[PDB]
Amino acid sequence: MKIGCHGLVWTGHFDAEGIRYSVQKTREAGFDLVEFPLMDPFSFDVQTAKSALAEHGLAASASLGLSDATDVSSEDPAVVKAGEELLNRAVDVLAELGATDFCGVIYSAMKKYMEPATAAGLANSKAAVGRVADRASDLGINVSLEVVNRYETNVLNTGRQALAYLEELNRPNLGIHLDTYHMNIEESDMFSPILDTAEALRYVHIGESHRGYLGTGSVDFDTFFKALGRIGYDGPVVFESFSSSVVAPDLSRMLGIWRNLWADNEELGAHANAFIRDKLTAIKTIELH
Amino acid sequence: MKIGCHGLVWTGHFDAEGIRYSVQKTREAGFDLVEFPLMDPFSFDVQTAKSALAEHGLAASASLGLSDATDVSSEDPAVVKAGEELLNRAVDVLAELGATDFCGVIYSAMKKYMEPATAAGLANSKAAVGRVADRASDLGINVSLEVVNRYETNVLNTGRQALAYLEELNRPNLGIHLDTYHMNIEESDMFSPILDTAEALRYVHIGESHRGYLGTGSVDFDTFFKALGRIGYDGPVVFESFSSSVVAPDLSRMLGIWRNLWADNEELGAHANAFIRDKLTAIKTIELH
Amino acid sequence: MKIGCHGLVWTGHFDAEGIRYSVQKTREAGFDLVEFPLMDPFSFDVQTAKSALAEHGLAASASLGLSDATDVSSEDPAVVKAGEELLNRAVDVLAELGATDFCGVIYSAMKKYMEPATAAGLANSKAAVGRVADRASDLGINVSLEVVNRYETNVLNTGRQALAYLEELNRPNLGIHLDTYHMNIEESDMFSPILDTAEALRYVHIGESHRGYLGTGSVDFDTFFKALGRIGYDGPVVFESFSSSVVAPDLSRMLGIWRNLWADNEELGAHANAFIRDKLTAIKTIELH
Amino acid sequence: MKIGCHGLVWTGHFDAEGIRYSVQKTREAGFDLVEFPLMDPFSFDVQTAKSALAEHGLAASASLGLSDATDVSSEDPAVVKAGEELLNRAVDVLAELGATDFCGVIYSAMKKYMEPATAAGLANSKAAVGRVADRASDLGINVSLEVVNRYETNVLNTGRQALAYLEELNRPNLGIHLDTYHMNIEESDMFSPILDTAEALRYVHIGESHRGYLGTGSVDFDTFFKALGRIGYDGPVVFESFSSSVVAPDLSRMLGIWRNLWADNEELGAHANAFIRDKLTAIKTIELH
Ligand SMILES: [Mg+2]
Ligand SMILES: [Mg+2]
Ligand SMILES: [Mg+2]
Ligand SMILES: [Mg+2]
């Protein structure tokens, strides 16, 4: 299991400087892995990232959220094709980095829909995601669909829905990515989604109810980690936090990061790293007693 | 204290038949009060409402959410003026009904903004709301701003933000409206917001994390009700839950109701009424032991 | 599933008067079943119980805790035999009532031990309970061991320890009884013990952390009922509450009931009956949405 | 604020070697303070303790529970006197160590009583404690009464009982010591007792529901630390944990430590030190957001 940190803790612009900076700060915070948010994978400087990752002995993953122009759940085949094109490039980036995990909101646009998903749209989404997963499979890359709340997608809001989505595709490298922040809204509790989704659970985001400091919100982390321990989850556990102190020109607007949740990402990162690691340490003793 | 139920539980269209139906269902479910959604107050059948309320001996309140055309936080004075007009009419409706509580998202549009709030926008919102409060005050009507999550507003996301907003306006009849559903995301916990806004807390919405049956989600209702009891809150406590089958396509899309958490609103309403009253009965015993 | 009330809500003396009083009050509070504490089954008035149960249409179960004189976990064979004799009579009483469930602290004395259990004592406990269970089996009676906290036994303090104890005996009518009050102290959380004990779980006590009003202490009922729902538990669910306003001469002392947690047991009882039934109703809805 | 560790994490025998071992391990785990259990203060090697404390740079406090022979709530004045004598020696040991804090179950025996307290016994307890406090005051020592559960005292089971007991004595150095383990049983929630005891709260124990690893049981630490932050508590915050792995001949039997909750106290101790510190760090951030 790799303990990771989302890139938006450190910077909103993933240029050469942002890449080295995020990688460095991640390592200094005590994390094993950095998750790069690849909103624009075409321009992502792979060589700099490879250099920085090697320098700090850090692993990497990639996440992304689609938009209207790249909505794979669209009824417009051209829009779907564009989204598929973007997803494929992200996967290519991961392959060049020698990474293994791609995740995020890749089954739809990451936004507040003003209509329910349509039958035709859902068919297009599943087909597009199937083709990306197949391609990723040949490159030795896993693809995990991140379940997000009603305001960020109209397709997959719960673990159960994600399981039904994956049932049709039946792709071996296709998994489910759960996020405590999103689970806090949609799920019935923190243990049930883990247990139902146990086979497919491939990626985990650790986020507080307001996406700030861990333990300063309403998320039931204790039940979540205990359930993770029960199913013997051994995949990535990545801290994710957003504040107006670190702004991504598009991503911050899309996630509605209006408020200040923290000013000092160094204290935040180190704290989050310890929070996650110590929780896992304690949870490991539970089976013994 | 009045135990209430949002009208949207029962019907999506508040015409003559809808008004009578929602009022009757509310009374049959055991509630003291019904909250009418006045999205369009100009076409609200006030007379039918007065009749139905008297028939069932039920109290009433009103809430609405603004839209793009009536966004009082806009930098466009034409838009701001439109919103203020909508607000003023709603207040007139309540005055006619002899009701005393107006609430909801009246300081901004109820939607997912793609940009942070602006200084000019905030100024316009505050000015308009102040004028509306003054108008309402003369009609003996209290106005409560409902704190909502980041996806429904970029203005008032926390109880403290609402306090700062109210401090500037310094209006006697201006209150704070808290909703457990929204609190469950943005707030640090369920007792701090109650304690901090005790002086200004005038309206309460009771909703599960996913707006389904009470007690089937992640809302810490226990801490919330304990906090309410500690500050001796005596205002309205109103249940809120939504179904795409029941509400209009407009509002269902606005609230992002992609899933239906219940099929029988009679059972839901009766369950919610007992949940609230029974919780209140229990919390009253705490001071005795 | 039968919803029940422990008799110490109503009376501490099960003479004929207490028997009829407890039965009647249980029916009036809305329950299906009364749980008689048979601290002395030799003198329990079976005849009055049968008569009251019939008059009020109520099912019945019974529980008890052993004492030093009846400690089947003693190394002294005469003490063990006196215990076994008491247990056997309790099973016989239940048989005469037409009941199906015996439970409680029947594997040791119900007290604060000052020494750990002993290998010889444990073997005595199991053998006696095995014989009691076999006897009960012939009579169509299920026997469930109540897991209780460290101050009330030194043998079975967690669900896991009860499973290991049963594994040895391999009896098909021998089950596990979990109590939220006891779980709240000893267990890692409120779902694991249910999931681990699924096969063997046959009786449930619903008690708040301080054994008063439900929802006025720190017990996580939500996690507990969600887990009960997940495994399809259909055994008895019995409210259990103790206050200085209702005193049993021995039992109130043994359980350390020093404080007033309630004066009005009719309010308490109706509240608890609603709490449990409403919780089960809500959990059933998680299924389909 | 001093973050501390109870000595029973390390050893059950406070001979010279035990004293040195406990102080060393406490320092190595990252704590500021060691809490000595002074069950027999007449035989406690003060000089070795001064030496070990100095060597490792550690502050110190002491606690004890009384027994039958020393029960200051007894109606027998010789028993009261013997208790008061043991208390006075414990204060002296602290004075010689240059410490400021005495605490624990010093207002009754620390045991499972078999009947409720008596008016006369209470009056003896209060007088004795008052005298011990006055003596302590002259030496610059604060005395804090540990509120414990029903199975360890019949006198002070809730914060509010302790408040009422202090009110009578009105002593300026006499405070309330709350323990999350005990609160988890007897209190209504984890914030009310903190808010109610605010001015009088002088000492804190941090204990999981089953007294093992922090975050592996049912204690609501988040509400507790958020309430602590709210009243700006600055007294000692001390980790307390018990396992059959490390046994005190007397104390482990009195506390009912039947089960192994950990084998490796070095891991346990560093986990707890981090747990408490990291929680305080996070709670500090809440007022900023
Ligand atoms: Mg995420
Ligand atoms: Mg609302
Ligand atoms: Mg019980
Ligand atoms: Mg303690």
mmCIF file with all atom_site columns, N, CA, C and O in Angstrom, chain B residues 27-55:
data_model
loop_
_atom_site.group_PDB
_atom_site.id
_atom_site.type_symbol
_atom_site.label_atom_id
_atom_site.label_alt_id
_atom_site.label_comp_id
_atom_site.label_asym_id
_atom_site.label_entity_id
_atom_site.label_seq_id
_atom_site.pdbx_PDB_ins_code
_atom_site.Cartn_x
_atom_site.Cartn_y
_atom_site.Cartn_z
_atom_site.occupancy
_atom_site.B_iso_or_equiv
_atom_site.pdbx_formal_charge
_atom_site.auth_seq_id
_atom_site.auth_comp_id
_atom_site.auth_asym_id
_atom_site.auth_atom_id
_atom_site.pdbx_PDB_model_num
ATOM 1   N N  . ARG B 1 27 ? -50.473 17.458 7.636  1.00 0.00 ? 27 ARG B N  1
ATOM 2   C CA . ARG B 1 27 ? -51.257 17.293 8.855  1.00 0.00 ? 27 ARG B CA 1
ATOM 3   C C  . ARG B 1 27 ? -51.390 15.813 9.185  1.00 0.00 ? 27 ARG B C  1
ATOM 4   O O  . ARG B 1 27 ? -51.235 15.403 10.332 1.00 0.00 ? 27 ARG B O  1
ATOM 5   N N  . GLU B 1 28 ? -51.680 15.005 8.167  1.00 0.00 ? 28 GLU B N  1
ATOM 6   C CA . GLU B 1 28 ? -51.857 13.575 8.378  1.00 0.00 ? 28 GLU B CA 1
ATOM 7   C C  . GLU B 1 28 ? -50.556 12.935 8.869  1.00 0.00 ? 28 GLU B C  1
ATOM 8   O O  . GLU B 1 28 ? -50.587 11.924 9.562  1.00 0.00 ? 28 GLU B O  1
ATOM 9   N N  . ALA B 1 29 ? -49.403 13.493 8.483  1.00 0.00 ? 29 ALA B N  1
ATOM 10  C CA . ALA B 1 29 ? -48.119 12.939 8.903  1.00 0.00 ? 29 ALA B CA 1
ATOM 11  C C  . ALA B 1 29 ? -47.788 13.328 10.344 1.00 0.00 ? 29 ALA B C  1
ATOM 12  O O  . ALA B 1 29 ? -46.817 12.843 10.911 1.00 0.00 ? 29 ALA B O  1
ATOM 13  N N  . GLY B 1 30 ? -48.557 14.242 10.931 1.00 0.00 ? 30 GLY B N  1
ATOM 14  C CA . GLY B 1 30 ? -48.370 14.601 12.335 1.00 0.00 ? 30 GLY B CA 1
ATOM 15  C C  . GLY B 1 30 ? -47.635 15.925 12.555 1.00 0.00 ? 30 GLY B C  1
ATOM 16  O O  . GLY B 1 30 ? -47.416 16.305 13.710 1.00 0.00 ? 30 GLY B O  1
ATOM 17  N N  . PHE B 1 31 ? -47.297 16.636 11.466 1.00 0.00 ? 31 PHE B N  1
ATOM 18  C CA . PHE B 1 31 ? -46.566 17.896 11.554 1.00 0.00 ? 31 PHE B CA 1
ATOM 19  C C  . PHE B 1 31 ? -47.448 19.085 11.970 1.00 0.00 ? 31 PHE B C  1
ATOM 20  O O  . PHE B 1 31 ? -48.647 19.148 11.721 1.00 0.00 ? 31 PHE B O  1
ATOM 21  N N  . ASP B 1 32 ? -46.813 20.077 12.585 1.00 0.00 ? 32 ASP B N  1
ATOM 22  C CA . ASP B 1 32 ? -47.480 21.302 12.977 1.00 0.00 ? 32 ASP B CA 1
ATOM 23  C C  . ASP B 1 32 ? -47.527 22.296 11.823 1.00 0.00 ? 32 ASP B C  1
ATOM 24  O O  . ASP B 1 32 ? -48.430 23.127 11.783 1.00 0.00 ? 32 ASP B O  1
ATOM 25  N N  . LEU B 1 33 ? -46.523 22.258 10.932 1.00 0.00 ? 33 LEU B N  1
ATOM 26  C CA . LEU B 1 33 ? -46.349 23.332 9.952  1.00 0.00 ? 33 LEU B CA 1
ATOM 27  C C  . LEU B 1 33 ? -45.890 22.791 8.596  1.00 0.00 ? 33 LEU B C  1
ATOM 28  O O  . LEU B 1 33 ? -45.223 21.765 8.484  1.00 0.00 ? 33 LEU B O  1
ATOM 29  N N  . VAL B 1 34 ? -46.260 23.519 7.550  1.00 0.00 ? 34 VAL B N  1
ATOM 30  C CA . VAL B 1 34 ? -45.881 23.174 6.192  1.00 0.00 ? 34 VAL B CA 1
ATOM 31  C C  . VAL B 1 34 ? -45.062 24.332 5.651  1.00 0.00 ? 34 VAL B C  1
ATOM 32  O O  . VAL B 1 34 ? -45.391 25.477 5.884  1.00 0.00 ? 34 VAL B O  1
ATOM 33  N N  . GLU B 1 35 ? -43.990 24.019 4.930  1.00 0.00 ? 35 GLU B N  1
ATOM 34  C CA . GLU B 1 35 ? -43.168 25.048 4.319  1.00 0.00 ? 35 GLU B CA 1
ATOM 35  C C  . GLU B 1 35 ? -43.442 25.067 2.822  1.00 0.00 ? 35 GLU B C  1
ATOM 36  O O  . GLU B 1 35 ? -43.135 24.107 2.122  1.00 0.00 ? 35 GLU B O  1
ATOM 37  N N  . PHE B 1 36 ? -44.020 26.169 2.349  1.00 0.00 ? 36 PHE B N  1
ATOM 38  C CA . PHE B 1 36 ? -44.355 26.301 0.940  1.00 0.00 ? 36 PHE B CA 1
ATOM 39  C C  . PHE B 1 36 ? -43.149 26.817 0.177  1.00 0.00 ? 36 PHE B C  1
ATOM 40  O O  . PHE B 1 36 ? -42.580 27.844 0.537  1.00 0.00 ? 36 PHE B O  1
ATOM 41  N N  . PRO B 1 37 ? -42.740 26.131 -0.908 1.00 0.00 ? 37 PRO B N  1
ATOM 42  C CA . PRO B 1 37 ? -41.716 26.674 -1.798 1.00 0.00 ? 37 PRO B CA 1
ATOM 43  C C  . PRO B 1 37 ? -42.315 27.699 -2.758 1.00 0.00 ? 37 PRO B C  1
ATOM 44  O O  . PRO B 1 37 ? -43.134 27.379 -3.613 1.00 0.00 ? 37 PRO B O  1
ATOM 45  N N  . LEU B 1 38 ? -41.940 28.962 -2.577 1.00 0.00 ? 38 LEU B N  1
ATOM 46  C CA . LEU B 1 38 ? -42.434 30.044 -3.431 1.00 0.00 ? 38 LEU B CA 1
ATOM 47  C C  . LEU B 1 38 ? -41.408 30.407 -4.506 1.00 0.00 ? 38 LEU B C  1
ATOM 48  O O  . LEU B 1 38 ? -40.896 31.528 -4.527 1.00 0.00 ? 38 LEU B O  1
ATOM 49  N N  . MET B 1 39 ? -41.105 29.467 -5.399 1.00 0.00 ? 39 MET B N  1
ATOM 50  C CA . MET B 1 39 ? -40.174 29.769 -6.473 1.00 0.00 ? 39 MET B CA 1
ATOM 51  C C  . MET B 1 39 ? -40.809 30.856 -7.336 1.00 0.00 ? 39 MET B C  1
ATOM 52  O O  . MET B 1 39 ? -40.160 31.843 -7.682 1.00 0.00 ? 39 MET B O  1
ATOM 53  N N  . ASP B 1 40 ? -42.108 30.688 -7.594 1.00 0.00 ? 40 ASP B N  1
ATOM 54  C CA . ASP B 1 40 ? -42.884 31.661 -8.334 1.00 0.00 ? 40 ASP B CA 1
ATOM 55  C C  . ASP B 1 40 ? -44.029 32.177 -7.463 1.00 0.00 ? 40 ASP B C  1
ATOM 56  O O  . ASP B 1 40 ? -45.144 31.669 -7.510 1.00 0.00 ? 40 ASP B O  1
ATOM 57  N N  . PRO B 1 41 ? -43.751 33.210 -6.647 1.00 0.00 ? 41 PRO B N  1
ATOM 58  C CA . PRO B 1 41 ? -44.708 33.792 -5.706 1.00 0.00 ? 41 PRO B CA 1
ATOM 59  C C  . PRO B 1 41 ? -45.813 34.600 -6.369 1.00 0.00 ? 41 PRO B C  1
ATOM 60  O O  . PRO B 1 41 ? -46.868 34.822 -5.776 1.00 0.00 ? 41 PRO B O  1
ATOM 61  N N  . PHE B 1 42 ? -45.573 35.013 -7.613 1.00 0.00 ? 42 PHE B N  1
ATOM 62  C CA . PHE B 1 42 ? -46.562 35.784 -8.347 1.00 0.00 ? 42 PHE B CA 1
ATOM 63  C C  . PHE B 1 42 ? -47.763 34.919 -8.720 1.00 0.00 ? 42 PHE B C  1
ATOM 64  O O  . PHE B 1 42 ? -48.873 35.423 -8.813 1.00 0.00 ? 42 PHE B O  1
ATOM 65  N N  . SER B 1 43 ? -47.547 33.619 -8.922 1.00 0.00 ? 43 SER B N  1
ATOM 66  C CA . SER B 1 43 ? -48.633 32.732 -9.313 1.00 0.00 ? 43 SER B CA 1
ATOM 67  C C  . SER B 1 43 ? -49.101 31.849 -8.149 1.00 0.00 ? 43 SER B C  1
ATOM 68  O O  . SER B 1 43 ? -49.864 30.905 -8.354 1.00 0.00 ? 43 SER B O  1
ATOM 69  N N  . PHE B 1 44 ? -48.629 32.116 -6.928 1.00 0.00 ? 44 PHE B N  1
ATOM 70  C CA . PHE B 1 44 ? -49.020 31.307 -5.784 1.00 0.00 ? 44 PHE B CA 1
ATOM 71  C C  . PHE B 1 44 ? -50.457 31.640 -5.374 1.00 0.00 ? 44 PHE B C  1
ATOM 72  O O  . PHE B 1 44 ? -50.780 32.802 -5.181 1.00 0.00 ? 44 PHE B O  1
ATOM 73  N N  . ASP B 1 45 ? -51.298 30.616 -5.252 1.00 0.00 ? 45 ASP B N  1
ATOM 74  C CA . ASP B 1 45 ? -52.694 30.793 -4.886 1.00 0.00 ? 45 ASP B CA 1
ATOM 75  C C  . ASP B 1 45 ? -52.803 30.979 -3.372 1.00 0.00 ? 45 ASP B C  1
ATOM 76  O O  . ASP B 1 45 ? -53.022 30.021 -2.639 1.00 0.00 ? 45 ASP B O  1
ATOM 77  N N  . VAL B 1 46 ? -52.643 32.213 -2.918 1.00 0.00 ? 46 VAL B N  1
ATOM 78  C CA . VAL B 1 46 ? -52.619 32.526 -1.502 1.00 0.00 ? 46 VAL B CA 1
ATOM 79  C C  . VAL B 1 46 ? -53.938 32.158 -0.836 1.00 0.00 ? 46 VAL B C  1
ATOM 80  O O  . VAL B 1 46 ? -53.946 31.669 0.296  1.00 0.00 ? 46 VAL B O  1
ATOM 81  N N  . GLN B 1 47 ? -55.051 32.454 -1.505 1.00 0.00 ? 47 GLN B N  1
ATOM 82  C CA . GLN B 1 47 ? -56.360 32.213 -0.921 1.00 0.00 ? 47 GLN B CA 1
ATOM 83  C C  . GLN B 1 47 ? -56.575 30.728 -0.663 1.00 0.00 ? 47 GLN B C  1
ATOM 84  O O  . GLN B 1 47 ? -57.119 30.373 0.376  1.00 0.00 ? 47 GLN B O  1
ATOM 85  N N  . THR B 1 48 ? -56.188 29.864 -1.603 1.00 0.00 ? 48 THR B N  1
ATOM 86  C CA . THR B 1 48 ? -56.359 28.433 -1.404 1.00 0.00 ? 48 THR B CA 1
ATOM 87  C C  . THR B 1 48 ? -55.520 27.968 -0.214 1.00 0.00 ? 48 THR B C  1
ATOM 88  O O  . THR B 1 48 ? -55.948 27.089 0.533  1.00 0.00 ? 48 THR B O  1
ATOM 89  N N  . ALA B 1 49 ? -54.337 28.579 -0.052 1.00 0.00 ? 49 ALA B N  1
ATOM 90  C CA . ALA B 1 49 ? -53.428 28.252 1.030  1.00 0.00 ? 49 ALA B CA 1
ATOM 91  C C  . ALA B 1 49 ? -54.053 28.611 2.374  1.00 0.00 ? 49 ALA B C  1
ATOM 92  O O  . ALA B 1 49 ? -54.015 27.810 3.303  1.00 0.00 ? 49 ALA B O  1
ATOM 93  N N  . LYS B 1 50 ? -54.623 29.814 2.460  1.00 0.00 ? 50 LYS B N  1
ATOM 94  C CA . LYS B 1 50 ? -55.253 30.282 3.686  1.00 0.00 ? 50 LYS B CA 1
ATOM 95  C C  . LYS B 1 50 ? -56.366 29.327 4.101  1.00 0.00 ? 50 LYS B C  1
ATOM 96  O O  . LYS B 1 50 ? -56.482 28.961 5.266  1.00 0.00 ? 50 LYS B O  1
ATOM 97  N N  . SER B 1 51 ? -57.181 28.939 3.122  1.00 0.00 ? 51 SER B N  1
ATOM 98  C CA . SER B 1 51 ? -58.301 28.046 3.357  1.00 0.00 ? 51 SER B CA 1
ATOM 99  C C  . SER B 1 51 ? -57.824 26.691 3.890  1.00 0.00 ? 51 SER B C  1
ATOM 100 O O  . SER B 1 51 ? -58.333 26.208 4.898  1.00 0.00 ? 51 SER B O  1
ATOM 101 N N  . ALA B 1 52 ? -56.866 26.067 3.183  1.00 0.00 ? 52 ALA B N  1
ATOM 102 C CA . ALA B 1 52 ? -56.379 24.738 3.528  1.00 0.00 ? 52 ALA B CA 1
ATOM 103 C C  . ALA B 1 52 ? -55.728 24.749 4.910  1.00 0.00 ? 52 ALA B C  1
ATOM 104 O O  . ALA B 1 52 ? -55.908 23.807 5.673  1.00 0.00 ? 52 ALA B O  1
ATOM 105 N N  . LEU B 1 53 ? -54.974 25.812 5.217  1.00 0.00 ? 53 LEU B N  1
ATOM 106 C CA . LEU B 1 53 ? -54.290 25.907 6.494  1.00 0.00 ? 53 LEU B CA 1
ATOM 107 C C  . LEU B 1 53 ? -55.306 25.942 7.631  1.00 0.00 ? 53 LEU B C  1
ATOM 108 O O  . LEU B 1 53 ? -55.160 25.227 8.613  1.00 0.00 ? 53 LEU B O  1
ATOM 109 N N  . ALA B 1 54 ? -56.347 26.759 7.473  1.00 0.00 ? 54 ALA B N  1
ATOM 110 C CA . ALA B 1 54 ? -57.386 26.898 8.483  1.00 0.00 ? 54 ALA B CA 1
ATOM 111 C C  . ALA B 1 54 ? -58.143 25.585 8.652  1.00 0.00 ? 54 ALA B C  1
ATOM 112 O O  . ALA B 1 54 ? -58.458 25.194 9.773  1.00 0.00 ? 54 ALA B O  1
ATOM 113 N N  . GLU B 1 55 ? -58.423 24.906 7.532  1.00 0.00 ? 55 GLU B N  1
ATOM 114 C CA . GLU B 1 55 ? -59.142 23.645 7.578  1.00 0.00 ? 55 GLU B CA 1
ATOM 115 C C  . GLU B 1 55 ? -58.387 22.623 8.423  1.00 0.00 ? 55 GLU B C  1
ATOM 116 O O  . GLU B 1 55 ? -58.998 21.902 9.207  1.00 0.00 ? 55 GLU B O  1
#
